Swiss-Prot record, chain A:
Belongs to the universal ribosomal protein uS17 family. Citrullinated by PADI4. It comes from Oryctolagus cuniculus (Rabbit). Keywords: Acetylation, Citrullination, Cytoplasm, Lipoprotein, Methylation, Nucleus, Palmitate, Phosphoprotein, Ribonucleoprotein, Ribosomal protein, RNA-binding, rRNA-binding. This is Small ribosomal subunit protein uS17. Its main location: cytoplasm. GO terms for cellular component: cytosolic ribosome; cytosolic small ribosomal subunit; nucleolus. SUPFAM superfamilies: Nucleic acid-binding proteins.
UniProtKB/Swiss-Prot annotation, chain B:
This is Small ribosomal subunit protein eS4. The gene is RPS4X. Residues 41-103 form the S4 RNA-binding domain. Belongs to the eukaryotic ribosomal protein eS4 family. GO terms for molecular function: rRNA binding; structural constituent of ribosome. The modification N6-acetyllysine is found at K232. InterPro entries: KOW (IPR005824), Rib_uL2_dom2 (IPR014722), Ribosomal_eS4 (IPR000876), Ribosomal_eS4_C (IPR032277), Ribosomal_eS4_central_region (IPR013845), Ribosomal_eS4_central_sf (IPR038237), Ribosomal_eS4_KOW (IPR041982), Ribosomal_eS4_N (IPR013843). CDD domains: KOW_RPS4, S4. Component of the small ribosomal subunit. Part of the small subunit (SSU) processome, composed of more than 70 proteins and the RNA chaperone small nucleolar RNA (snoRNA) U3. Identified in a IGF2BP1-dependent mRNP granule complex containing untranslated mRNAs. HAMAP family: Ribosomal_eS4. It comes from Oryctolagus cuniculus. Keywords: Acetylation, Cytoplasm, Isopeptide bond, Nucleus, Ribonucleoprotein, Ribosomal protein, RNA-binding, rRNA-binding, Ubl conjugation. PANTHER family: 30S/40S RIBOSOMAL PROTEIN S4, SMALL RIBOSOMAL SUBUNIT PROTEIN ES4. Pfam families: 40S_S4_C, KOW, Ribosomal_S4e, RS4NT. It is found in: Cytoplasm; Nucleus, Nucleolus.
Swiss-Prot record, chain D:
This is Small ribosomal subunit protein uS8. The keyword Nucleus applies. The lineage of its organism: Eukaryota, Metazoa, Chordata, Craniata, Vertebrata. InterPro entries: Ribosomal_uS8, Ribosomal_uS8_CS, Ribosomal_uS8_sf. Pfam families: Ribosomal_S8. Its main location: cytoplasm. Component of the small ribosomal subunit. Part of the small subunit (SSU) processome, first precursor of the small eukaryotic ribosomal subunit. During the assembly of the SSU processome in the nucleolus, many ribosome biogenesis factors, an RNA chaperone and ribosomal proteins associate with the nascent pre-rRNA and work in concert to generate RNA folding, modifications, rearrangements and cleavage as well as targeted degradation of pre-ribosomal RNA by the RNA exosome. Required for proper erythropoiesis. It is found in: Cytoplasm; Nucleus, Nucleolus. One of its GO terms (biological process) is translation. Component of the 40S ribosomal subunit. Part of the small subunit (SSU) processome, composed of more than 70 proteins and the RNA chaperone small nucleolar RNA (snoRNA) U3. The keyword Ribosomal protein applies. NCBIfam families: PRK04034.1. It comes from Oryctolagus cuniculus (Rabbit). One of its GO terms (molecular function) is structural constituent of ribosome.
UniProtKB/Swiss-Prot annotation, chain E:
HAMAP family: Ribosomal_uS15_A. Disulfide bonds: none annotated. The gene is RPS13. There is a cross-link at K26 (Glycyl lysine isopeptide (Lys-Gly) (interchain with G-Cter in ubiquitin)). This is Small ribosomal subunit protein uS15. Pfam families: Ribosomal_S13_N, Ribosomal_S15.
Length: 151, 262, 185, 129, 149
RNA sequence: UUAAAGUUGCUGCAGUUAAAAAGCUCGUAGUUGGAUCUUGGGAGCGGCCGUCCCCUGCUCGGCGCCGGCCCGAAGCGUUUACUUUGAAAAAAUUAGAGUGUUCAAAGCAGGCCGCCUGGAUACCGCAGCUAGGAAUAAUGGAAUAGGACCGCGGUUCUAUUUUGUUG
């Protein structure tokens, strides 16, 4: 399930080759997991604690920090891997005609494999990060399901 | 611009530099120092507009390098030296000292002080650092790196330093019930007591300050200077004690002074 | 005893007296065929406007459908055992606060204030069901509700309309006048 | 189909007031309609107005008198501020000595002088004079 | 007015204000429950169950006696139809119209009515998708019309 | 080029005959969408009413006392638009306070006989940050009960304050 590509995937905080007294069983083969509290009142989920995925851009198990703006949006498409596009619908005001117009500005955010219970239409919130790609700047902090989907 | 700017236009100057328009094209850009450009005051501006000791830009230079003016116990020979909040300035020969405190409006004010009060200076700690061989460090709001401080000095406290030895004598803790004043913004020079301190994670932590007569206002965390422990101030406050008289009471006071003067 | 309470508190002497009177009434009559499981929750005596009083019995809602076939004789036995006080069966219902943005599942519309007040008004007049209802708004801003009843079962109800108006004024706070129009039948 | 019930109610009562009748059959019911008619009653423009209870939709019968010039609706609901309301009473009210502008407020459906003295504002509803 | 016709007709029911069971009715809630169960086991639309009950049993409204309508009873027992009845009737009408047109090519107004009922089917299917009654992948097409119930 | 132009019309134009309703219908994006959810009360002043107070739950403590009460607080409380306040929002310029440049456009000066001053204030569309209310408009709670609540019954990983010193 893991180690797909031409290089080893590891978390460069822990040491995965500690020498035990025996190197047998009963205390070994449970590797430690690196995680941190991202702050701003957000709570880390269990999937980032007991998971086995390896990332370098995950807000929980990764080398990226959260600072700046906190936004929200609705998930539109899940086609490209490990990152999704959300839609922000907002209203614009004109001084001349005292009437509003709705506008949308879709943009790409990053989805770690910690949140894999995501379908089209789920409301997510994002936080500003350093540029992780050409057009990707935001990391998803939590996921909220839409109406229905009771299964 | 391929490099740093070296000129400064007259109408691009800050308003608290308190200049005129139809005098010259340029304004005195201060040399880099402890204080920022928009929050300091050049020595030429003070000596040529406030104290009226000099009239031109050469007389200020003659007085400045004549070794007559001492800045926080050190003689300075730069005519555009940045002087900011509670910069103790001394004239040794005529025996006068001035303390720079913001008055009831948004500006500086001349304030003659006794020499016994001119020996020390209240200043605000900015951040706490740890040195090379486990030495704690303090960074002060006028960039005074002090080695080995008191263990009870926190991030937003105020320390009192003797100008002859550079060490800490006494301190004020950041807590509600202490006399405070604001340095910057719409509020400036008002003296009040801290009551509330609202914590916002990831942004500016606003506080609430009540005046001694019944007025209240809210400023940011960076716009805080603690000056007293309770009601008694540790320094000599200027005239009016920083009460921020409104325009009606100011008009009434000016009319009363005009009627009494005749 | 006969009286039970959803709240864990001992009933007072008046409702215990009403429960004992009901137990005696089913003891010396044929009411025991229909009161083995049916009971009483609470009772209250309130000053109906004038020189005459009346009692109000709080009944749980799912037992009122069983009582709906029984009120033909219980009421007349209750004025005949008493002196002249009328008896009114008002079901108990819980009034829930509106779910605001400050203060968990859905509060249903059956538990809303308007619904329980209309249900109290409906259970207030059992033999005379609702045929018309009007609201009067006077110049003071107050609301004067009016209730129109059928021309069936008039003579046994027309002497208790002021009792219904008094107990509806005390329980809710709305002035209700009862009238008998001759429209349909 | 129908969009605003207040617009139809105000047009119906305006037509029946211009024809000179005394009773108006407002066929919809709403909280805003009852509150608007209550404000018009409190400011001495109408009399005893009814609410006919029904399990479908209530009907309102008002007691007209020769006192109303025109009552109207401003559709859609335009939000105002305290300083913005002065232009609205400049171009909507016929005079400053009389006339009223009813605007929606968090304190309830309530007129413009009271919203001025309570230091507030909100969406507009209509006008009467 | 109608959604596909210029008519402005006003002809419908008129429920009375009186919210009470009639005293002369001798049908309890249980008896009308197995009456509805038997009429649904006979293979009837709930409207047919309602008209049969109101004619031959003297009940005014079922939800005024039982406490809920017919489709709630049929869903609670477990014998309600999979497809709703009005959209099923619209589908069967569309199949009847199409079996007229591909037997009789030259008619045009019947093709116009076919377009109208296809639009009605599409709008009702969109509403049932919005109400999460139909599956989201449900799609009506002519090529599986007569194969569909 | 602006006003006059209500001859560009959001406020605020016209479409039978003067310029102008597609031949008709369905239909996607857009725009607009019915009723319905907490009413009413009390302590009092002026004499029923225009101003006053009351009708979200829980782990640590200072305004007071004799393990028992109130006050506060590390920390959480369904989300939007709208509305009021607060922060910050360069100067000059626009209103605007003071001031006999001989008035004014100006300018930030000046007045008493060393002394006393001023060098304010408002505005800064929208968007981002905050604090009282939820009337107005849109979403969601449970119907296949994978609904709340109450005390019980089984499966696991980890905390030093202890089974006489220490292993």
């Amino acid at each position: 399930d893991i180690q797909t590509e031409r290089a080893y995937q590891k978390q460069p905080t822990i040491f995965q080759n500690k020498k035990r007294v025996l190197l047998g069983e009963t205390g070994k083969e449970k590797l430690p997991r690196y995680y941190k509290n991202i702050g701003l009142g957000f709570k880390t989920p269990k999937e980032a604690i007991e998971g086995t995925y390896i990332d370098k851009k995950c807000p929980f198990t990764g080398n990226v920090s959260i600072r700046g703006r906190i936004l929200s949006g609705v998930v539109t498409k899940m086609k490209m891997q490990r990152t999704i596009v959300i839609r922000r619908d907002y209203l614009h005001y004109i001084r001349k005609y005292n009437r509003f117009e709705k506008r949308h500005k879709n943009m790409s955010v990053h989805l770690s494999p910690c949140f894999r219970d995501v379908q089209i239409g789920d409301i997510v919130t994002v936080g500003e990060c350093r540029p992780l790609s050409k057009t990707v700047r935001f990391n998803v902090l939590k996921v909220t399901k839409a109406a229905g989907t009771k299964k | 611009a391929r490099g740093p700017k070296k000129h400064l236009k007259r109408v691009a100057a800050p308003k608290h530099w308190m200049l005129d328009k139809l005098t010259g094209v340029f304004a005195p850009r201060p040399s880099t120092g402890p204080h920022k450009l928009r929050e300091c005051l050049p020595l030429i501006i003070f000596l040529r507009n406030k104290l009226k000791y000099a009239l031109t830009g050469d007389e200020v230079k003659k007085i400045c390098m004549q070794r007559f003016i001492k800045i926080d116990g050190k003689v300075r020979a730069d005519i555009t030296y940045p002087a900011g909040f509670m910069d103790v300035i001394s004239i040794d020969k005529t025996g006068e000292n001035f303390r720079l405190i913001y008055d009831t409006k948004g500006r500086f004010a001349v304030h003659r002080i006794t020499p016994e009060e001119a020996k020390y200076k209240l200043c605000k700690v900015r951040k706490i650092f740890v040195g090379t061989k486990g030495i704690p460090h303090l960074v002060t709001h006028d960039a005074r790196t002090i080695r080995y401080p008191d263990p009870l000095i926190k991030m937003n406290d105020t320390i009192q330093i003797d100008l002859e030895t550079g060490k800490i004598t006494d301190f004020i803790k950041f807590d509600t019930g202490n006399l405070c004043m604001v340095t910057g913004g719409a509020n400036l020079g008002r003296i009040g007591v801290i009551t509330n301190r609202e914590r916002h994670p990831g942004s500016f932590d606003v506080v609430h300050v009540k005046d001694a007569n019944g007025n209240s206002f809210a400023t940011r965390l960076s716009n805080i200077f603690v000056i007293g422990k309770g009601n008694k101030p540790w320094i000599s406050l200027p005239r009016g004690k920083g009460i921020r008289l409104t325009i009606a009471e100011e008009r009434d006071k000016r009319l009363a002074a005009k009627q009494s003067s005749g | 005893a006969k009286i039970v309470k959803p709240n864990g508190e001992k009933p007072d002497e008046f409702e215990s007296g009403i429960s004992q009177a009901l137990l005696e009434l089913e003891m010396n009559s044929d009411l025991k065929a229909q009161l083995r499981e049916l009971n009483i929750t609470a009772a209250k005596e309130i000053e109906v406007g004038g020189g005459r009083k009346a009692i109000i019995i709080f009944v749980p809602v799912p037992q009122l459908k069983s009582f709906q076939k029984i009120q033909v004789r219980l009421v007349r036995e209750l004025e005949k055992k008493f002196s002249g006080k009328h008896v009114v069966f008002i079901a108990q219902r819980r009034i829930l606060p509106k779910p605001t943005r400050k203060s968990k599942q859905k509060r249903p519309r059956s538990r809303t204030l308007t619904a329980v007040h209309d249900a109290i008004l409906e259970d207030l007049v059992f033999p005379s069901e609702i045929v018309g209802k009007r609201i009067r708004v006077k110049l003071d801003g107050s609301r004067l509700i009016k209730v129109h009843l059928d021309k069936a079962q008039q003579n046994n109800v027309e002497h208790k309309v002021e009792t219904f108006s008094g107990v509806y004024k005390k329980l809710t706070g709305k002035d209700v006048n009862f009238e008998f129009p001759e429209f349909q039948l | 189909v129908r969009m605003n019930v207040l617009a139809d109610a105000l047009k119906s009562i305006n037509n029946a007031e211009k024809r000179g009748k005394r009773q108006v059959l407002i066929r919809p019911c709403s909280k805003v309609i009852v509150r608007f008619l209550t404000v018009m009653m409190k400011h001495g423009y109408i009399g005893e107005f009814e609410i006919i209870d029904d399990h479908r939709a209530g009907k309102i019968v008002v007691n007209l008198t020769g006192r109303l010039n025109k009552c109207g609706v401003i559709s859609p609901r335009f939000d105002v501020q305290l300083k913005d309301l002065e232009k609205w009473q400049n171009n909507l009210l016929p005079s400053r000595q009389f006339g009223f502008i009813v605007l929606t407020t968090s304190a309830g459906i309530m007129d413009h002088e009271e919203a001025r003295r309570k230091h507030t504002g909100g969406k507009i509803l209509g006008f009467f004079f | 007015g109608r959604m596909h016709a210029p008519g402005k007709g006003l002809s419908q029911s008129a429920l009375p204000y009186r919210r009470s069971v009639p005293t002369w009715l001798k049908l309890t809630s249980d008896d009308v429950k197995e009456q509805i169960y038997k009429l649904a086991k006979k293979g009837l639309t709930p409207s047919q169950i309602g008209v049969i009950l109101r004619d031959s049993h003297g009940v005014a409204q079922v939800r005024f006696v039982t406490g809920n309508k017919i489709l709630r009873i049929l869903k609670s027992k477990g014998l309600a139809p999979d497809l709703p009845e009005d959209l099923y009737h619209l589908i069967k009408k569309a199949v009847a119209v199409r079996k007229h047109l591909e037997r009789n090519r030259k008619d045009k107004d019947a093709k116009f009515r076919l377009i109208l009922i296809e639009s009605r089917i599409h709008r009702l299917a969109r509403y049932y998708k919005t109400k999460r009654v139909l599956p989201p992948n449900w799609k009506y097409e002519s090529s599986t019309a007569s194969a569909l119930v």
